[PDB]
Design a protein around this ligand. Structure first.
Ligand SMILES: OC[C@H]1O[C@H](O[C@H]2[C@H](O)[C@@H](O)[C@@H](O[C@H]3[C@H](O)[C@@H](O)[C@@H](O[C@H]4[C@H](O)[C@@H](O)[C@@H](O[C@H]5[C@H](O)[C@@H](O)[C@@H](O)O[C@@H]5CO)O[C@@H]4CO)O[C@@H]3CO)O[C@@H]2CO)[C@H](O)[C@@H](O)[C@@H]1O
Ligand SMILES: OC[C@H]1O[C@H](O[C@H]2[C@H](O)[C@@H](O)[C@@H](O[C@H]3[C@H](O)[C@@H](O)[C@@H](O[C@H]4[C@H](O)[C@@H](O)[C@@H](O)O[C@@H]4CO)O[C@@H]3CO)O[C@@H]2CO)[C@H](O)[C@@H](O)[C@@H]1O
Length: 476
């Protein structure tokens, strides 16, 4: 009697490439590529477990651009430059970026503390600010190779900065290949999402917000996004075919978002299985065990993730010692294992690149201890998505209807509802009336609405600039 454990790490970035200048206006795709996107599947090289991954096609596009040397990244150019050639604006954006990440454990360098107490920086101090920002995002693989430079902590030269950059781009160049390798070796399944990570339920039927938040105000959806919804899925199938050689049979719905109509569309497009959130299941069915494989209308397989276990990694364990956190995690799986007489399937699903920056040492002590302890447990069998879809000694249930929602409170309020987010949908709706190319699909990505209508934060202007630029470009 085994507990079946399914890790599904979801990787995504919206398109930071501004369509008129061709410039990557934020460096987040680069920094999460060198820190997490290669290194997360790379754990499978050292640990005999199964781990699954989601790669959005818009993320894949940017990884390709960086890997091929075509990405003009404005922040990264400020990093690469000799400090004597830095513009005042570039120094300000460098300092701004440091302040934003300053309290995170991966930025725990004494020299960063010294430099941010300084009101004017010379060439050597700017070289340290540039290079330590690079090194703060160093992933597990290169933290071994670059350990001498990392322990330095200060006094970096342009030659050393350039060396780190060359190693980082080598990491990026091998990133798509290692997803292909762990997939071909059976160490994990790889899924994708509709192309630009949109909210498929809203594009299909904006009225589905009223299944959870009946009081919410939405704009006049005077155009249909239903065909655009199909296009996100179809284009995603094409990009996945290019990278991995098959049409995808697993998809992660952006924000875990599902509806009766969205599940229909996924089935119609040949998706055999997806996962969503436990809150959906609780909102939809009275007797709701998340340890079963569900069949929506006998059309498509649905797993409901263990929200508690997913939220321990995403939200709790960063503030713990690695050893305490893994003993807690295994202790919870043991109680699940001891709680039922059948073999439960336990889906752990969350973003794969966003939580580790808040852990000590980028979560490497935690994940190494976690994966080491998992592979020693005889009563735990980690599964690929393919193995979870096919496993016969697993309990099964049919569900006929779900309440539309997301894994954020089970509703859509993080992307629609208040004046400012609704203004984005107004802009999108008007632009869709006049759209002439697929940049309208880029503007349907969920990220733009997430950051809109929120307390002012540094760089929120860039997401707004990107969204409006994609909207403008879509109509030309
Ligand atoms: O404002 C108060 C608030 O601020 C702080 O949050 C800030 C972060 O700490 C800071 O680093 C920065 O966040 C960045 C982020 O680091 C950067 O990587 C990028 O985020 C990407 C994700 O990396 C990417 O995975 C994707 O995220 C999706 C995800 O795929 C999906 O599954 C789901 O979870 O939604 C996510 C969002 O759509 O895309 C995003 C970009 O859209 O960009 C971020 C913004 O610059 O800035 C944050 C805001 O200031 C504190 O951390 C927080 O506690 C404070 O309360
Ligand atoms: O900025 C603060 C935090 O940043 C990081 O958190 C990330 C997570 O890593 C991502 O996975 C994602 O979080 C998802 C989350 O996985 C999903 O379960 C859901 O979580 C709900 C949760 O059930 C609920 O109980 C409550 O705690 O709020 C969550 C949000 O409603 O939805 C999340 C949003 O997509 O993104 C967050 C950042 O938003 C980092 O890991 C944290 O340490 C950090 O505090």
């Amino acid at each position: 009697k085994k507990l079946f454990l399914v890790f599904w790490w979801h990787m995504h970035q919206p398109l930071y490439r501004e369509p008129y200048t061709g410039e990557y206006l934020l460096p987040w795709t680069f920094f999460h590529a060198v820190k997490d996107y290669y290194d997360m599947p790379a754990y499978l090289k050292d640990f005999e477990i199964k781990l699954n991954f989601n790669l959005t096609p818009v993320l894949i596009d940017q990884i390709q651009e960086y890997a091929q040397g075509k990405a003009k990244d404005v922040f990264l150019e400020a990093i690469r430059k000799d400090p004597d050639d830095l513009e005042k604006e570039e120094v300000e954006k460098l300092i701004e970026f440091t302040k934003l990440n300053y309290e995170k454990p991966i930025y725990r360098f004494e020299r960063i503390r010294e430099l941010m107490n300084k009101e004017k920086l010379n060439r050597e101090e700017l070289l340290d600010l540039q290079t330590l920002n690079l090194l703060a995002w160093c992933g597990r693989t290169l933290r071994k190779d670059l350990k001498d430079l990392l322990n330095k902590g200060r006094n970096y030269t342009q030659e050393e900065k350039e060396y780190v950059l060359n190693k980082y781009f080598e990491i990026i160049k091998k990133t798509l290949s290692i997803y292909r390798e762990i997939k071909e070796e059976g160490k994990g399944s790889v899924s994708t999402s509709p192309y630009y990570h949109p909210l498929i339920p809203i594009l299909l039927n904006p009225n589905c917000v009223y299944e959870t938040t009946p009081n919410v105000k939405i704009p006049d959806f005077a155009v249909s996004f239903r065909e655009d919804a199909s296009k996100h899925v179809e284009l995603a199938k094409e990009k996945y075919f290019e990278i991995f050689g098959e049409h995808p049979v697993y998809m992660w719905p952006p924000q875990a978002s599902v509806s009766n109509e969205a599940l229909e569309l996924y089935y119609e497009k040949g998706i055999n299985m997806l996962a969503t959130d436990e809150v959906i299941l609780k909102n939809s069915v009275e007797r709701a065990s998340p340890y079963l494989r569900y069949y929506f209308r006998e059309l498509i397989s649905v797993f409901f993730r263990d929200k508690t276990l997913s939220d321990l990694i995403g939200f709790s364990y960063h503030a713990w010692n690695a050893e305490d956190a893994v003993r807690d995690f295994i202790g919870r799986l043991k109680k699940i294992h001891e709680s039922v007489d059948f073999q439960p399937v336990v889906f752990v699903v969350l973003d794969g690149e966003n939580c580790w920056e808040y852990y000590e040492e980028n979560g490497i002590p935690f994940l190494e201890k976690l994966y080491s302890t998992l592979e020693k447990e005889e009563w735990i069998e980690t599964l690929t998505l393919e193995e979870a879809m096919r496993k016969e000694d697993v309990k099964t249930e049919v569900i006929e209807s779900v309440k539309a929602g997301t894994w954020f409170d089970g509703n859509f309020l993080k992307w629609i509802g208040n004046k400012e987010k609704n203004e984005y949908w107004k802009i999108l709706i008007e632009a869709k009336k006049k759209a002439k190319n697929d940049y309208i699909l880029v503007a349907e990505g969920s990220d733009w609405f997430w950051w809109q209508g929120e307390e002012k934060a540094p760089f929120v202007e860039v997401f707004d600039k990107l969204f409006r630029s994609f909207v403008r470009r879509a109509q030309e």
